[PDB]
Inverse folding.
RNA sequence: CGGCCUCCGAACGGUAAGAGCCUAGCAUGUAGAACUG
RNA sequence: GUGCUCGCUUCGGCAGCACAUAUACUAAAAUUGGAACGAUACAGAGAAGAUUAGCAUGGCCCCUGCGCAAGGAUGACACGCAAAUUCGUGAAGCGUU
């Protein structure tokens, strides 16, 4: 219900969140729609976390409806935990996860090797899920603060608005030359055109800066 | 030190009163020039998002008097140099 | 934002009991005019009376000096238009959005330079209290300010909640009465206020002493003196108001004539005495003699 | 102290709200939304209390 | 009697920008309502 | 309402004392009003000859994004620009003749 309220509060009626937590477009989107309807890694991470908990809850709902078994419930939970990689799709929004994915694969190999030793064969029924379960509980120990902060940000942008007054953006790698000139010509203005004035009316600063620009082109061309 | 300590912790993060209406007008009240009231603080819901849209975007101190000097004007000699 | 102590509003809007129940909610809402977020107080004015709430920016309320919940003035309880026009006030209340934000901000800075006793700005320097406004004030409390709304349910018959209905189970005023359309902005700015306009047609029906024709008729006829009126006492009454040119107290009429040497004295005196002259408790009537 | 309620209280509340499309609720709408920020905590608390295959 | 075994995917970056009109949505649940010899 | 009075005092009431103390945006409502990037329909792309990569400044302009990153046609818009000023107008004072 929370993810739907968010979608429809954003008015994206052309999108649909189904009950296994996949977000799907319902038609083809024009450009303005494709743009307004992109969601970020906060929304998609909350989705896939909720998708994993649903898979676990419904393994138990089947056992409680009578459909499977205690042994098949255990084996299925152990499947979920060793294969969170291809059941959910969390890694696309946090590729750091593949470290937990590789951990749970390694534990699978260790446990199967020790399990299927003698009479028991290479079939499915091994459920020892304490290991992978541990691993994802530590994953969440960590991600819970991240997502609380990210989702607070997204909701506070939704309910107050987007603040552009005092952004204070950095100078990064693409703004380095433009910034150098912004500052060179701010400094030139300060320095001469109001500490050596008596251009009293206007110190034709916009023309002294044209001389500065032409001096640089002449240097460059020799 | 302690004032800035307050403000740093701030920006990181029923009791009674006596009221004299000043329009008291003994016929206005039941007849008491002083009212006693307990103010209490209403609880906020933890599960609720920022209320009103402060993204909005917009009268300073009196202008300082220019204890300046008088300017003395521009010769034509300098106005050409 | 503002974070304050308590609301200033008419004692009528306060209510009947000497002990009040008021709950504070910090930054609870934005002013209906100022839109500045201000701490709101909620009060239960009486049993089965609708709960009142602080309804305007603290700065917006210190500016115009009205009931910060009832919208009526704090002195007599008169709507902005009527109170101001009777005080001879033509105020430049901001209506622009940007100039309104800037205005309420600067006015909060001025109220910050103010000391919480007198209404800030020009709103005070017109303090010649007008008897028309005084008589236009409701001298007893109008606690009808807290009577509940109508319940559409019982208005169609449907309110099966019993007496637990949060609205008065009374026949709804068919909207056409212009007393129904007083938006907060209208009642605040005092523009297109039709309740106050009916008050103005009233004030035009309220009797004053109409002036006679002849600019030599400076004879003010006093009626209703009794036998306990003294000539010198009525002289002391009309004395500082100008020159009393002659006194003629008709005891066989229980009347009198005060002849004035100044037409201005006679006019201003009669107008100040109209239906308000109280000597020895007598309801004295000023008129212009023939 | 704070005393606990019967389970049908919450079971009924949630069943009623169903999926918040009925217009009756429509203020829950924004509080419901505001509770999103704490949803990764509810998931963590749910999954660490999983029921352990020797129990039904 | 030594052993030695990577990599696995998502977003932006291309299919415009608009002015207008039309019509559900979406916000409020308000304040206050007549006066005489 | 529970209970206790070696209570009136039967098993009824009544009495007395003990304990128990104030919820609530009171509303199932009723109005009230903007928007939906939806059609429609027009409309219809920076720099010099042509085709075109961008990174900025500015400000009551915003959108997607966790974002102090990035993107949105270089996001869009900025498009009169005034001004003093080369010489005179006149106005008014302060001194000289
Ligand atoms: O289905 P996958 O994800 O490919 O995993 C399988 C599988 O494990 P699951 O049972 O969890 O599905 C196998 O184990 P068995 O079930 O067959 O016992 C098997 O491993 P073994 O052959 O060692 O049993 C196999 O390995 P291979 O790649 O050799 O087919 C592989 O496990 P991996 O994760 O190593 O691929
Ligand atoms: Mg591009
Ligand atoms: Mg850009
Ligand atoms: Mg730009």
């Amino acid at each position: 219900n929370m993810l739907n309220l968010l979608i429809h509060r954003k008015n994206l009626n052309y999108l649909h969140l189904d009950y296994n937590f996949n977000l799907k477009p319902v038609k083809t989107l024009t450009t303005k729609e494709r743009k307004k309807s992109r969601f970020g890694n906060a929304f998609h991470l909350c989705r896939e976390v909720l998708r994993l908990t649903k898979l676990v809850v419904d393994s138990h709902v089947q056992y409680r409806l009578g459909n499977v078994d205690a042994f098949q419930l255990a084996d299925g939970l152990q499947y979920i935990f060793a294969h969170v990689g291809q059941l959910t799709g969390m890694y696309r929004y946090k590729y750091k996860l593949m470290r937990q994915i590789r951990m749970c694969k390694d534990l699978k190999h260790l446990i199967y090797y020790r399990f299927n030793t003698g009479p028991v064969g290479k079939g499915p029924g091994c459920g020892f899920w304490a290991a992978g379960w541990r691993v994802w509980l530590f994953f969440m120990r960590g991600i819970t603060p991240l997502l609380e902060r990210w989702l607070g940000n997204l909701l506070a942008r939704q309910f107050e608005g987007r603040h552009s007054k005092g952004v204070a953006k950095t100078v990064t790698k693409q703004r380095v030359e433009s910034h150098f000139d912004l500052e060179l010509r701010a400094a030139v203005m300060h320095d001469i055109l109001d500490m050596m004035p008596e251009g009293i009316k206007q110190n034709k600063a916009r023309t002294i800066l044209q001389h500065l620009s032409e001096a640089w082109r002449c240097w460059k061309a020799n | 030190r302690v004032a800035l300590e307050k403000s740093v912790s701030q920006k990181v993060a029923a009791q009674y009163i006596r009221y004299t209406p000043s329009q008291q007008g003994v016929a206005f009240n039941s007849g008491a020039k002083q009212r006693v009231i307990r103010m209490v603080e209403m609880q906020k819901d933890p599960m609720e998002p920022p209320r009103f849209k402060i993204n909005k975007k917009i009268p300073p101190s009196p202008p300082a008097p220019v204890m300046h000097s008088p300017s003395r004007k521009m010769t034509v000699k300098e106005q050409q140099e | 934002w503002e974070d304050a102590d308590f609301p200033i509003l008419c004692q009528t809007c306060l209510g009947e009991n000497p002990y009040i129940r008021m709950t504070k909610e910090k930054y609870g809402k934005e002013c209906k005019i100022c839109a500045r977020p201000f701490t709101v107080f909620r009060w239960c004015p009486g049993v089965r009376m609708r709960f009142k709430k602080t309804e305007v920016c603290q700065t917006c309320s210190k500016l115009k000096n009205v009931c910060q919940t009832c919208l009526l003035d704090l002195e007599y309880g008169l709507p902005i238009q009527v109170r101001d026009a009777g005080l001879s006030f033509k105020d430049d209340m901001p209506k622009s959005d940007v100039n309104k934000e800037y205005y309420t901000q600067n006015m909060e800075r001025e109220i910050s330079n103010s000391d919480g006793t007198r209404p800030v700005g020009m709103l005070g320097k017109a303090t010649s209290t007008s008897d028309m406004l005084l008589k236009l004030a409701r001298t007893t409390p109008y606690y009808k300010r807290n009577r509940p709304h109508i319940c559409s349910f019982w208005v169609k018959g449907e309110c099966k909640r019993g007496e637990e209905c949060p609205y008065r189970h009374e026949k709804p005023t068919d909207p056409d009465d212009p007393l129904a359309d007083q938006n907060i902005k209208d009642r605040y700015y005092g523009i297109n206020d039709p309740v106050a306009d009916k008050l103005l047609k009233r004030a035009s029906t309220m009797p004053r002493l109409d002036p006679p024709e002849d600019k030599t008729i400076t004879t003010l006829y006093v009626g209703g003196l009794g036998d306990t009126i003294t000539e010198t006492d009525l002289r002391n009454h009309f004395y500082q108001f100008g020159e009393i040119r002659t006194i003629t107290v008709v005891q066989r009429q229980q009347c009198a004539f005060i002849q004035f040497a100044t037409r201005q004295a006679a006019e201003v005196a009669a107008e100040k005495s109209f239906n308000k002259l109280i000597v020895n408790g007598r309801r004295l009537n000023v008129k212009w003699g023939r | 102290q704070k005393e606990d309620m019967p389970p049908e209280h919450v079971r009924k509340i949630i069943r009623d709200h169903g999926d918040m499309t009925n217009r009756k609720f429509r203020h829950d709408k924004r509080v419901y939304l505001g509770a999103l920020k704490y949803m990764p905590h509810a998931v963590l608390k749910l999954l660490e209390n999983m029921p352990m295959p020797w129990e039904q």
User: Anything to note?
Assistant: Residues 32, 53, 55, 69-72, 79, 138, 142, 144-145, 147, 149, 173, 177-180, 182-184, 187, 195, 198-199, 202 of chain C lie near RNA strand E (CB under 10 Å from a C1'). Residues 209 and 271 of chain C are 6 Å apart (CA to CA).
